[PDB]
Structure 1
Amino acid sequence: QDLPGNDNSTATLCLGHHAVPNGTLVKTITDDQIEVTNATELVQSSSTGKICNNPHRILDGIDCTLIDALLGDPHCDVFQNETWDLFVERSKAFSNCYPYDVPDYASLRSLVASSGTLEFITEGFTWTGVTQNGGSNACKRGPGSGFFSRLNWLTKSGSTYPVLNVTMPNNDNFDKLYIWGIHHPSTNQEQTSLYVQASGRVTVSTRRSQQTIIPNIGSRPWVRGLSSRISIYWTIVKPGDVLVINSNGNLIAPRGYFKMRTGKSSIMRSDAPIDTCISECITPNGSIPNDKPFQNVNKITYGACPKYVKQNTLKLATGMRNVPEKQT
């Protein structure tokens, strides 16, 4: 084939792999610090500190909680018919109208929170025989005494509180949420001054259910000049059903219905600033990027967020083992 290769030499070929001076330690099945060429962090652990106002509809509650916004505390009149993807409730919020309590506050707040709307429709309830629009100096509307915009405090007319028995048909094709209440007087004298009968009673019902609440007379702690209280209740009336409100005293009547919807809305308690930036994941500590799979910022989240994890760092190796050649 070829002629005399006079010289007959050799060559050396060596295979090898890179190494970096720096390197990163990662956990393994068999070791928990092994050093690799490179790794990537899978736990998002820091918020921007601000709630981005995009893409979800963030409604800042300012100094109103959602229930006060719903009831219509004077200072929350800003929120009427408002809507939201996320209502943010602030630590600073305060109530400033007639002292009330809500037996299952927690569910009423939830219920409204995820409906996502405070759209109110007024309906023509006719209360015959009682005085309407009662208010109080503890719920100042402007210079005057006032009350919650969405409720209607009835008292006697002259010398009588008749037995109210009204009805309101749900004829539309959606559910109607009604918020009503009962007034608990401080004294038996107060009970009779306002409602004549010495024992009120409110029964609100539909074809499917009924609630009867009887008031409770007695002194409570002075809150805005008052020892009395009103307790808030709610009734949902389904399409085709009918509301019947029947009372013989102490009723705080509804003025119509909030309409309920079904959506992605929820509520979040946070004092983080709202800012203009787009971010899908919201945490009460501010928005966080959902580029990583897990997060350690907060277990409370709204939107497309990483799964909360107890760990603050989890590094996924993205490179081979690092076997450098020098000394240490």
Structure 2
Amino acid sequence: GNPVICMGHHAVANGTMVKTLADDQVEVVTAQELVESQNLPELCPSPLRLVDGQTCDIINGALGSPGCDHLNGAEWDVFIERPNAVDTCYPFDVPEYQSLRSILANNGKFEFIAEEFQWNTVKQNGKSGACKRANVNDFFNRLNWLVKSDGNAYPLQNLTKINNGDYARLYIWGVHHPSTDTEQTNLYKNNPGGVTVSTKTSQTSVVPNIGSRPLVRGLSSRVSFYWTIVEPGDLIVFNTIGNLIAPRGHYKLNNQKKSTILNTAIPIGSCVSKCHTDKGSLSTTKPFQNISRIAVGDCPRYVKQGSLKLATGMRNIPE
């Protein structure tokens, strides 16, 4: 009596090293990489809606700077802001810049509603050579530059916009900063000027600053931009004795704000992906990625490791 039967398992010539709790290098027959380390050299325009700012960043888009007209009516899941975006208008600053940029980005649309402001004797539509539009002196197309009458009057301004619609409104308004008191006086007569924007629940007051400032786009003067959100049932009051860069209306806010912004130079292609990094879209089923902590959409989780191998087979012991 001597037939023999043996029970055994498969093997291959060269398997894959994996880690366990116990051992850092164990050879198994097959394994699968869980960290995505390759990205597409482009951003996928589907199935998320990407809006390419091109030359305008999102703040300049909102203000209506020249070159930003392609952003009118734009709706996005992800606003693509370009590193080489260029200023094309009056030198300006925004005191809570990142906060405004967040609101605009999160909101997800540029839907502007023109409104009629009955500014008193003051003259409207001040323009500049710092803000040329089609080689003609111009300004932010969402803003209205008010100055004294020809008969040197800047009467205290005071008009009111009432929100009785079914959506919160965003008003963007500014304050002008002359480089001289002469400059101040030839513009607004009054010195100092001043703005107070009020709602039922808030009032915001700005006193203009006059000083020598670096030449930006051939100017030493500046505009500072502010914003006011007016919920339905509330309203907004504008008050000026000089220096107001007035709104021409309001942007619409969504009730639910679900969008965001991505700053990257990566071109938009023709691929399909729901995961976007600042280095390009990912096309993967892996649960992790080491490409960038900056990631928007339906993405793998960002980790530090370059590789994590999951065993998908038994230990490899050949011969």
What TM-score do the two structures reach when normalised by structure 2?
0.98
CA–CA separation in structure 2 for the residues paired with 1:83 and 1:104: 24
CA–CA separation in structure 2 for the residues paired with 1:171 and 1:138: 38
| Corresponding residue of 1:121 | 113
Which structure has the larger Rg over C-alpha atoms? 1
| Corresponding residue of 2:309 | 315
| TM alignment of 1:245-324, pairs within 5 A | 245-261=238-254, 262-324=256-318
Question: SS in structure 2 opposite 1:22?
Answer: coil
Q: Partner letter of residue 267 of structure 1?
A: I
**Cα deviation 1:258-302 (Å, max 9, x = unaligned):** 001123211100111101121011111111124000111110111
C-alpha contact (below 8 Å) 1:280/1:290 kept by paired residues: no
Select the residue among 48, 55, 61 that pairs with 2:53. Answer: 61
CA–CA separation in structure 1 for the residues paired with 2:35 and 2:133: 50
| TM alignment of 1:72-221, pairs within 5 A | 72-157=64-149, 158-221=151-214
Structure 1 unaligned runs (5+)? Answer: 1-8
Question: SS in structure 2 opposite 1:88?
Answer: strand
CA–CA separation in structure 1 for the residues paired with 2:223 and 2:260: 27
CA–CA separation in structure 2 for the residues paired with 1:289 and 1:276: 13
* Post-superposition offset of 1:68: 0.4
CA–CA separation in structure 2 for the residues paired with 1:72 and 1:150: 5
What TM-score do the two structures reach when normalised by structure 1?
0.95
C-alpha contact (below 8 Å) 1:38/1:317 kept by paired residues: yes
CA–CA separation in structure 2 for the residues paired with 1:224 and 1:318: 62
Q: Indicate the RMSD between aligned Cα atoms, in angstroms.
A: 0.8
Question: SS in structure 2 opposite 1:52?
Answer: coil
Q: Partner letter of residue 208 of structure 1?
A: T
The count of aligned residue pairs is 317
* Post-superposition offset of 1:90: 1.0
Quote the sequence identity (%): 56
Select the residue among 11, 14, 17 that pairs with 1:22. Answer: 14
CA–CA separation in structure 2 for the residues paired with 1:293 and 1:88: 25
Structure 2 unaligned runs (5+)? Answer: none
**Cα deviation 1:299-327 (Å, max 9, x = unaligned):** 011110000000010000011111112xx
Q: Which runs of 4+ in 1 moved over 6 A?
A: none
Question: SS in structure 2 opposite 1:274?
Answer: coil
Question: SS in structure 1 opposite 2:225?
Answer: strand
**Cα deviation 1:193-240 (Å, max 9, x = unaligned):** 000111011000100111000100011111111100000000000001
* Post-superposition offset of 1:91: 1.4
CA–CA separation in structure 1 for the residues paired with 2:76 and 2:232: 24
Q: Partner letter of residue 283 of structure 1?
A: T
